[PDB]
Amino acid sequence: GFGCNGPWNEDDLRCHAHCKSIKGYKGGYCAKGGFVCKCY
């Protein structure tokens, strides 16, 4: 994962960091119990 490893490890800031690092995205957040790094 990219920061999102469940409610026991919710590095949302890291998911946003990841997605932001990819030109085209604005950010990212940990969805599905914080198991999925969803970029937007």
From Swiss-Prot:
Changing residue 38 to A/C/D/E/F/G/H/I/L/M/N/P/Q/S/T/V/W/Y: Complete loss of antibacterial activity. Residues 6-9, 31-37 are annotated as: Binds to membrane interface. Beta-D-GlcNAc-(1->4)-Mur2Ac(oyl-L-Ala-gamma-D-Glu-L-Lys-D-Ala-D-Ala)-di-trans,octa-cis-undecaprenyl diphosphate binds at residues 2-4, 12, 18, 29, 31, 33, 37-38. Changing residue 31 to C/D/E/F/H/I/K/L/M/N/P/Q/R/S/T/V/W/Y: Complete loss of antibacterial activity. It is found in: Secreted; Host cell membrane. Disulfide bonds join 4-30, 15-37, 19-39. Belongs to the invertebrate defensin family. Type 2 subfamily. In mice infected by S.pneumoniae, it has an efficacy comparable to vancomycin in the peritoneal model and to penicillin in the pneumonia model. Antimicrobial peptide that potently acts against several species of Gram-positive bacteria. It selectively inhibits peptidoglycan biosynthesis through complex formation with the cell wall precursor lipid II (1:1 molar ratio) thus inhibiting cell wall synthesis. It does not disrupt cell membranes. Is especially active against numerous clinical isolates of S.pneumoniae, including all 90 different serotypes and isolates resistant to clinically used antibiotics. In vitro, shows considerable selectivity for bacteria over mammalian cells. This is Fungal defensin plectasin. The lineage of its organism: Eukaryota, Fungi, Dikarya, Ascomycota, Pezizomycotina. The gene is DEF. The chain holds residues 56 to 95 of 95 of the full protein.
